[PDB]
Symmetry: D2
Subunit: 429 residues, 4 copies
Amino acid sequence: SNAIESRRAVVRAWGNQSIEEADPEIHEFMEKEKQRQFRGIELIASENFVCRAVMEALGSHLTNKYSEGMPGARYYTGNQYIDQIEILCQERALAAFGLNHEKWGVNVQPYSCTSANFAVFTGLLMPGERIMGLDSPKVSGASIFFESFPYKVDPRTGYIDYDKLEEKALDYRPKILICGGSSYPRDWEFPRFRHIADKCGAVLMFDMAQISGLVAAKESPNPFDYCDIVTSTTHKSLRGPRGGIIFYKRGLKPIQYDFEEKINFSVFPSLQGGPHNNHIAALAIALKQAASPEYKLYMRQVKKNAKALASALISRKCKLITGGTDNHLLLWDLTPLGLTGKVYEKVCEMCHITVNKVAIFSENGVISPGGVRIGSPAMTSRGCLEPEFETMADFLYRAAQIASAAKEIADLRNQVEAFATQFAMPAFD
Amino acid sequence: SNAIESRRAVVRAWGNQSIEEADPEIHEFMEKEKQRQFRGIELIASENFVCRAVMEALGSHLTNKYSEGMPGARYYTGNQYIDQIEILCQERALAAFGLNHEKWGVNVQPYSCTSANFAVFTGLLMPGERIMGLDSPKVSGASIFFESFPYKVDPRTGYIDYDKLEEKALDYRPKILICGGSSYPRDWEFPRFRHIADKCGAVLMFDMAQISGLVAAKESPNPFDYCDIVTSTTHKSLRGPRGGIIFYKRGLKPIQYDFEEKINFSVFPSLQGGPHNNHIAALAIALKQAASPEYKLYMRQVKKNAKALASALISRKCKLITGGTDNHLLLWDLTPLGLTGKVYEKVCEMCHITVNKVAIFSENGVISPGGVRIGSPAMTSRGCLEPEFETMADFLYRAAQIASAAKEIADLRNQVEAFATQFAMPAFD
Amino acid sequence: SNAIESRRAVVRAWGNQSIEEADPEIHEFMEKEKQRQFRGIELIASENFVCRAVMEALGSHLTNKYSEGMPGARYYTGNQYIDQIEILCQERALAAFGLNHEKWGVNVQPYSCTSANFAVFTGLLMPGERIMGLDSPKVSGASIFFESFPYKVDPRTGYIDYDKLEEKALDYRPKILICGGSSYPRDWEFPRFRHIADKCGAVLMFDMAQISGLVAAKESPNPFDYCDIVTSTTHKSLRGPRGGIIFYKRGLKPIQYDFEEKINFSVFPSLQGGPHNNHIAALAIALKQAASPEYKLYMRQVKKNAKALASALISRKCKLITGGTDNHLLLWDLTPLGLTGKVYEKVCEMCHITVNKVAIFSENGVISPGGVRIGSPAMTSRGCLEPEFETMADFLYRAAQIASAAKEIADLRNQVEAFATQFAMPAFD
Amino acid sequence: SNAIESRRAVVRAWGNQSIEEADPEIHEFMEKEKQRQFRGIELIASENFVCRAVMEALGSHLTNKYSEGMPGARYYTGNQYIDQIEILCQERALAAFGLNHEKWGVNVQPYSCTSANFAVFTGLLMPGERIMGLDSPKVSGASIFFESFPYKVDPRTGYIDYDKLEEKALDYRPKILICGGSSYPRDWEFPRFRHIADKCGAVLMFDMAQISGLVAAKESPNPFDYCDIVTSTTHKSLRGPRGGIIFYKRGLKPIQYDFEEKINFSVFPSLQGGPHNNHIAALAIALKQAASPEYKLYMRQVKKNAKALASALISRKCKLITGGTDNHLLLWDLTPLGLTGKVYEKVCEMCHITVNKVAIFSENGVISPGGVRIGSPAMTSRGCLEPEFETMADFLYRAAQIASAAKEIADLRNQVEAFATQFAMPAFD
């Protein structure tokens, strides 16, 4: 039919336009942002670069299909292939962390790690029961609808005070004891948490926001040997898309485990709509890489690049909280240098160096504004080895040296850009 | 440096792989799903096809940047270009609906319409205050943390009973009166809601889940002349990515309006993490199209394709709830034909026809399982005009005729596939 | 010992003083009030006159023993005889209402009927769950801690609309459906409440504040044939001391009944301290009286006196809500006469007539302030028969005639006093 | 009239019967209890002996008038004289504790100290907000409807650890910080509580259940110098009737004070019905006595009798918690003697000695069941001086010697009786 043929040309002329054709203004901004990422140093601990395959999935046709529900029993029919993808993504999630499907289940639908945590609480608690997690020195949604009693690192050392923690948890008796989160540069002592959770009758939950990739690479201690629930992000050290994961115990107890029905129903229909199918397939791709040998090398390099950068700052008499790092991030007290995190943040940005401020403690226990947080995963994905992270520490210290005027920035920005533009940007050129 | 050059080839060999190279198994499933969409009839009222530009944004590099916060005051530095994009997206959102920035504000960060509704409640209510929305004939997250008292359509007619509604709202006095949602095939009488909300002291909220595109095209009544809050999806009639929007009143009242601080803080940091930057730029692209003249033609055709399909079913003595539709969807009572929605759902799927079941009322007021819901936006984007929606009604009725055996399916599937494969699939060939 | 002997004189010198000796000022005020009760007409439906036995119990030595707990299981020792009194009082309560101890249990410790109702809610419900009771045309403690959705009488008739109530209860699904309370001048239809409670899954509670003596005397329908929980006052028509009672079902269901442990534990130790031993023994005396033939004659006179007062107002063309009464109280609309309840209230008081105002409806549906409530138990305990209640109707009407003029109050007060002093006052001379 | 005359005989025949006439069975039980109090040693710290004036008020005609509301603003009319009594009682309460009416207000309606505490919470706090008080080593109504985080004494010493308490309060940030309650044998340090309350932003409440007479007599530190709210019982050391009191700050702050309207409205109509008029007049009598020189001598003897009983146990090598007492009560650890509190409890009862068991700590930190609590107000009101409290220590110890053998109980009971009957019983002969 000639009418049907001209109908196809109308669809294609709309459906098949590129960004530069369809929205010149958005394309201009998206190109300026590609240059910004290529021409700067990315030291924000929670940033990374996704590969092209992850990007192809993110920008694919699976979003056209609505898939409310969980695989196998879907609200909408026509999900044969979306179901395969999500099951494969579930299987790969269990495999990346060496989990057995008879002891662990996994939900890959949370829109983010925050939603995933909130989903755990909603599934396991009545509104107003007691949770107890780590706070940085009614804001969060968890503390609006639940009673939350955050614990704190020892101001004097930067490390968690586990004895005070056991006292608090025993006194308060939360239903969920949460470890993980914020920006803690050392290893969590999962045995002591398990011991504490056992004594006070709480479920033990690990939020692996910042370190899921290290755990997968067997380069951080394994929470799954000790926790009952583990949630994670998918975009940080894992290098997948935005999103979150909920892992939970299954089967008989050391009466069965309760989590699976409650958590699934809490994700949908309670708190979310349909899943972001494009994100789920992208995560399948990232989770298949998280289990590769190549990815284990990357994570080892992340850990080694963070150490090399820490050491270079230590050799310039910088005060780092806990004195270093076990993982990929480090917290730098700028108060000795007479600087605040806010001021330093803005000077670094003037030099194509992105860091972010964080609240820290002074030795005496007062909250200081002079904290900055940095990390290695992003520039490690761009190819940087240890010599380059030492150079970057030199940029960082020089920026601080400048900000102690509280002109010469042009030199630093020129040097940072000359430096950064030497390294590939994944999925582009 | 030769070392730095080989470092670039390592990054590129990982960063620049395609799906078919990097994950053959996921690529197989994603290709089977492209064929499924191309070779079938998509009649689920909430599905649509995104264009390539939207897809290019969805699969772009903006996700590498973390952008916690709202534009202008960001937690992380380095968001100059992401801020531009989100502001442009905010401006375009106001423009698509003819809103003035001095009377309306907009947040484009909700991960979905559900999150966006939940965000409104969290920002405006204490846990446990009274909301009152429309229900289909403690499940939802809103009813877990808030006291919710759903109202119902008149079982006898399918239409909302506004007099009973005014009585209920006056008796119960909710803090928020919500219209919109589920799968209501007629126009909402915003004047009566405003009248009812005024009498009982509630804020008036419209959830335009299903009809945001019609509203934008000035082809459905305008909620913004009457509501105080309007939330919407972004992937259904709008043809953007997944996501939600919150619009809210600003400035002086007919003491200023309160919504802006509360709703923004509820989206972040309370309930969400950082925004899905790729989704926001994709939405900017879709919102710039939603305001075009071409898009107004598309929506007019959606409305006309839904009517043509309704009429063709009416001429075969099908019972449709309210007897037709004002918009893009229609609800079909299959009980006369001696069928349930579940059974019919599975037979259609055997013929590459996707519909979804919904609960409906019988005339006497008992809940019937024989409801099915269908809609026109998806196949309208593939180019279908009214003659093709009449053909599709013929497929639908024949499928029902078959399912009254409660063999000849091969003929129907063959005919549906021969039919569907005549129409372009946006962004592909 | 001389020492020990003189120590007795000191104790007696303090312990054995009369009120007039020890507190002349309080004695003066208490004599003024005794005169006021004797020289006045007491027409407040809630008031009555306790006998000397009740007063001797209220003013006895049982208060000296602290008795936290329930009988047979008390916190303290020394309760051998207090236990027997509370047991006897429990047994007499069951007997007064014809109840069998292995289908009904009873707790006589509540400090007041309000406490008793709140104790039931605390025991049976989680904080924030739904109750539904009658309201007069946040305030109550029940509505602060639970979600209350009150129902109302039909404004046009004064009677409850059981069809609107069944609708509301099915829509709202309360966990407790309460009847009784306020000042309903007619019989509750317990069979309809039982049917409504059954359809929506609620516990059926009757608060028999006003009519508990009428029920005891078999002059009002028996709530225990239908309810699951029955609370009551003890000082109104029962003529006992201040306090409340909780009756609850026991044993097998037509799994055992839940209430006993939950309700007792809510009374003590959750909401109350030790019981008022003086009040429990007083109640034992009143409950023994309530089961006797003489009390049945008193309640019959109470009904006949209220009926005679009503008919006398009716012949003066007064408008009474529902047009009369089934029990001991009536509601009178003073709007036609051009008076407010509060204006008429204070005029009556000048004439030694105590009544109290109440909110009522007008025939349309607006709240009228011209309601007054009166009832017969107090003056029936003073000996008045039907002729004396017709005299009192004449006083009431003449008082209203005076207040429509807004002096000759003096004449009406003197007539009320000459009238009221004709009648004995229980327990004095 | 002959009719009217015979009607008086009927009323008098019922109204004027004695308990012995009207209820022989209750009279028998009440005489048995009068003997039991007279022939026993009452060492329960909570008990006391009301005088005849208090009993005549408790057994008077004021109960016949219903009096919902606060004085000067009552629901009903006819309250001219009841108002003056409650005013007088309010004034005497302020006077007994040296308070000025334009810095402190008082509500004398609470049915019990427990009711009074709960009324304060309901008035000052939203449901689900945080209180923090002392617990003995969900249960209480406060913890069902609010979030309670109890603090505890230092197990090793019996004293409160004010440094751990300041830490807890800063961590938990309660809205009300409560001191007082349970059975603390030592002085509360109000200055530290005020400092803790200030640092964490809480209202400071003192529940003076046990020591309200000592405070009135100036024999215990004055809580009103530091607290914002003070509740109290009325029947323990005050020797009044059962009931409670709420004192609250008024007027300008060192914006006005919030408590008055919130607290009064919580008492009535939220949580209670009308007040117990007989109890309010009784309290007026007790409060007048409490401000008199004679009462100050009684409380001094109460302190000296408790001190003499303690020293006698101490010389028998008993272990008392904190080693003694500042007030009227002491706690005794029976673990060294090899006894449980409950075993010793029931033995004492066989010898006409009333004590009650309590939970205590061992020196390590485990809960011991071997606690017993005793105190001096009851037998001091019967006339005992220090020598008689030393005799009583000998009874107590000899009782414990018997129970370590787990007969010669008979000898000890007969000695207790011969001893106890030496002493007068207030208000009888």
